[PDB]
Design a protein around this ligand. Structure first.
Ligand code: HEM
Ligand SMILES: CCCCCCCN1CCC[C@H]1C(=O)N[C@@H](Cc1ccccc1)C(=O)O
Ligand SMILES: C=Cc1ccccc1
Length: 455
């Protein structure tokens, strides 16, 4: 029962590459999936991949005995500054499992309890900023959630204060990081990337990587000269020992991990909080239920670790926001051996797949007809959700190491947000999703009305 898989429109020798010549390539790929179905072939000069959109097929793709993590072209470009850090290393490179073993303890329960106070530090700065707005001023939502999430990973992970709420413009790190991600995304469709027409792109890229590495240098220098005993993510990078190889990370890999965790440790969480607030103001009944939980649980001026763990409906709000708009919207796999997908699509060892997460999460055979609705109650019982239907944090041993960090931060922050403010979608905002490999609302603004509850 070997099927012929569909393929979107081609452009001669450029094959499908020009379909990526858009500012919104993930959303263009979702529209193609809408048209072609659960699997389609996508070719570029010298490369083939297959985009999967159905839980039927993706549940097989998530079999780690058959498929391993692949570096997509996007991750190969990001590797230019993230190196063999955890996000952009191959599973078989020695530094992947070594850094995984050394850094996994930085995301244990005990580690999260130790991060909690500094998460509150930044969260209180956010609440205070909004309490201090004048009447009819508004909140620039993705901008403020980036301030919050960047500052949280800086402080909790590295004892470094980006002081984003003291800035009306983005921290230089953010400016260069966004420009580097923009460049990597635009480079995806460049048929001749070495054409001198991109000399300036290349120079700018190098400049943005330097800016990013200069901050890394400062973070490292401050820690090794410090007279305060820390026990954070950076402590583990500098001192942790891999039980298997027995070795600590070397200096070159440490710098890659710092870059990796500064970027991965905030960008996707700012997208999540932005989408979550968007869906909450667009679904006032859901907002009310979540606000009622926040009021009942957050009975102290400062939330505790234990209280955040009881914000269970807020947790489902965030999972439902990750369902509709997972902020790292795809991951890539390669076949470890010859194998057949879904009884219909034979693959050879080395063949590549892309998992198109926002389309997987719209599989009507899993979620039902109401798939576009924002209904956090879908997550009331994980046992009622089929295997591999919900993959916003990737798969298997290569799943997101920071998942608990992200969800604790986002649960804490959204809980305080709902405890302290009413929110108004005063412009009737039309969702506009900006792509920088990752996904985030653009131009999303709201008004907040203080409940005047002291901190
Ligand atoms: C809601 C926020 C987040 C989302 C949606 C998310 C999503 C993902 C996804 C899908 C992957 C797999 C990528 C692939 O297979 O190519 C991944 C990997 C990773 N994420 Fe996250 N992430 C989030 C937050 C974080 C945070 C806060 C950190 C750091 C504190 C983090 C650190 C990482 C790292 C290090 C990896 C690579 C893991 C490995 O392969 O060993 N992420 N994330
Ligand atoms: C950084 C965390 C999010 C990463 C998401 C990456 C996911 N891409 C973000 C933008 C679009 C999407 C994607 O489909 N990319 C493919 C594109 C591609 C396929 C075949 C040949 C050439 C290029 C790729 O990068 O290989
Ligand atoms: C370098 C890794 C990364 C991770 C998430 C978003 C952008 C970049």
């Amino acid at each position: 029962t070997i099927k012929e898989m569909p393929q979107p429109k081609t452009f001669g020798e450029l094959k499908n590459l020009p379909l990526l010549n858009t500012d919104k390539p993930v959303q263009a790929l979702m529209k193609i999936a809408d048209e072609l179905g659960e699997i389609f072939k996508f070719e570029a000069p010298g490369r083939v991949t297959r985009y999967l959109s159905s839980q039927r097929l993706i549940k097989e793709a998530c079999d780690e005995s058959r498929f391993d993590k692949n570096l997509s072209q996007a991750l190969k470009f990001v590797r230019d500054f993230a190196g063999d850090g955890l996000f952009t290393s191959w599973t078989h490179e020695k530094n992947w499992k070594k850094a995984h073993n050394i850094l996994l303890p930085s995301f244990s329960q005990q580690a999260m309890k130790g991060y909690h106070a500094m998460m509150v530090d930044i969260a209180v700065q956010l609440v205070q900023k909004w309490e201090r707005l004048n009447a009819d001023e508004h909140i620039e939502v993705p901008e403020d959630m980036t301030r919050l999430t960047l500052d949280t990973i800086g402080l909790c992970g590295f004892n470094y204060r980006f002081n984003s709420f003291y800035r009306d413009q983005p921290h230089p790190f953010i400016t260069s990081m966004v420009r580097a991600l923009d460049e990597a995304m635009n480079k995806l469709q460049r048929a001749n990337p070495d054409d001198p027409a991109y000399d300036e792109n290349k120079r700018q890229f190098q400049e943005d990587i330097k800016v990013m590495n200069d901050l890394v240098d400062k973070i490292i220098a401050d820690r090794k000269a410090s007279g305060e005993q820390s026990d954070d993510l950076l402590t583990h990078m500098l001192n942790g020992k891999d039980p298997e190889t027995g070795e600590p990370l070397d200096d070159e890999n440490i710098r890659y991990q710092i870059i990796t965790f500064l970027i991965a440790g905030h960008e996707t969480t700012s997208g999540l909080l932005s989408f979550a607030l968007y869906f909450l103001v667009k679904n006032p009944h859901v907002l009310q239920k979540a606000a009622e939980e926040a009021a009942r649980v957050l009975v102290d001026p400062v939330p505790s670790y234990k209280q955040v763990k009881q914000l269970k409906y807020v947790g489902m709000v965030l999972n439902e926001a990750l369902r509709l708009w997972p902020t790292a919207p795809a991951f890539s796999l390669y076949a470890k051996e010859d194998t057949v997908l879904g009884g219909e699509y034979p693959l050879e060892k080395g063949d590549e797949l892309m998992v198109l997460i926002p389309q997987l999460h719209r599989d009507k055979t899993i979620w039902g007809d109401d798939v576009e609705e924002f209904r956090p109650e879908r997550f009331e019982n994980p046992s009622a959700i089929p295997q591999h239907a919900f993959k916003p944090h990737g798969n298997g041993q290569r799943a997101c190491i920071g998942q608990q960090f992200a969800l604790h931060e986002a649960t804490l922050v959204l809980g305080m947000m709902l405890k302290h403010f009413d929110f108004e979608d005063h412009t009737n905002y039309e969702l506009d999703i900006k792509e920088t490999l990752t996904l985030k609302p653009e131009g999303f603004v709201v008004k907040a009305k203080s409940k005047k509850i002291p901190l």
